[PDB]
Amino acid sequence: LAKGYRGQRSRSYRRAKEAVMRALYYQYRDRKLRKREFRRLWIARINAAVRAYGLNYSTFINGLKKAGIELDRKILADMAVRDPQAFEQVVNKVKEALQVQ
Amino acid sequence: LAKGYRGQRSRSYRRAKEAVMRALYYQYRDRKLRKREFRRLWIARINAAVRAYGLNYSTFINGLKKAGIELDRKILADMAVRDPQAFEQVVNKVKEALQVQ
């Protein structure tokens, strides 16, 4: 046991652990960056979808929250292309929650 | 709000609710699957790499466990190409451990 537990003062240990640390870093980074690329499209797409409805990503979000609708950007973005009419409903239910005087 | 919380028996509900579930089933299937192609990739390399040292994926995993070495096949398949030498050192530790008189 030298890589699972107990950090030997071994000459070989120091080298193997260094390799383990480099695997961890590179992977962790690809994950985060890959994940950043998506969140990027999710918002680009959602904004673009509510344009024709007189809204922008910012207003659609701060509106969804005051209507009690709990949905993620990956779900939002998906719906807009999978079921366009259902997507329209959420928007209306949000325009209703917003425009109230 | 036939989406976030409270499942009102309206036309909107069912429609928007089916949409959510479809977005969920799809994104879930892609993860599982993508996570499944890699799992196969890893094992295929680690095997081919432990080849010349006189072992296969099976024996190498049995050894990693008798020597108390907790490393992922994700980490493993990484080291095998990033630091071939350090990899050799884990091999030699498993092989050693393995033979007992």
- List the end-to-end C-alpha distance of chain A, in Å, as a whole number: 70
Q: CB contact, 8 Å: A70 with chain B?
A: yes
> What are the backbone angles phi and psi of residue A45, rounded to the nearest 5°?
-70, -50
> What are the backbone angles phi and psi of residue B50, rounded to the nearest 5°?
-90, 0
Angle (nearest 5°) at CA A88 between A86 and A91: 120
- Encoding tokens for residue A95? 């325009």
Q: CB contact, 8 Å: A26 with chain B?
A: yes
Biggest alpha carbon–alpha carbon distance for chain A? 74
Question: What are the angstrom distances between the C-alpha of B24 and each of A41, A78, A79?
Answer: 18, 9, 10
Nearest CA-CA partner of B90 in B100, B80, B82: B80
Question: What are the angstrom distances between the C-alpha of B70 and each of A1, A32, B66?
Answer: 8, 24, 10
* Chain B residues touching A15 at Cβ < 8 A: 83, 85-86, 89
DSSP one-letter code for B9: S
Question: What are the angstrom distances between the C-alpha of A75 and each of A24, A65, A72, A91?
Answer: 30, 15, 5, 14
CB contact under 8 A, A75 and B24: yes
Q: Which domains does chain B have, with CATH numbers?
A: 1-32 (1.20.5.1450), 33-101 (1.10.1900.20)
The resolution of the experimental structure, rounded to one decimal in Å, is 2.9
* Chain A residues touching B66 at Cβ < 8 A: none
Nearest CA-CA partner of A26 in B44, B80, B82, B31: B82
Rounded CA gap, A23 and A41, in Å?
Answer: 28
* Chain B residues touching A89 at Cβ < 8 A: 12, 15-16
DSSP one-letter code for B100: -
Please, which experimental method was used?
A: X-ray
Mutate to test the interface with A, among B35, B64, B75 (most CBs of A within 10 A): B75
**Which helix (H) or strand (E) covers residue A59, if one does?**
helix A57-64
Q: CB contact, 8 Å: B54 with chain A?
A: no
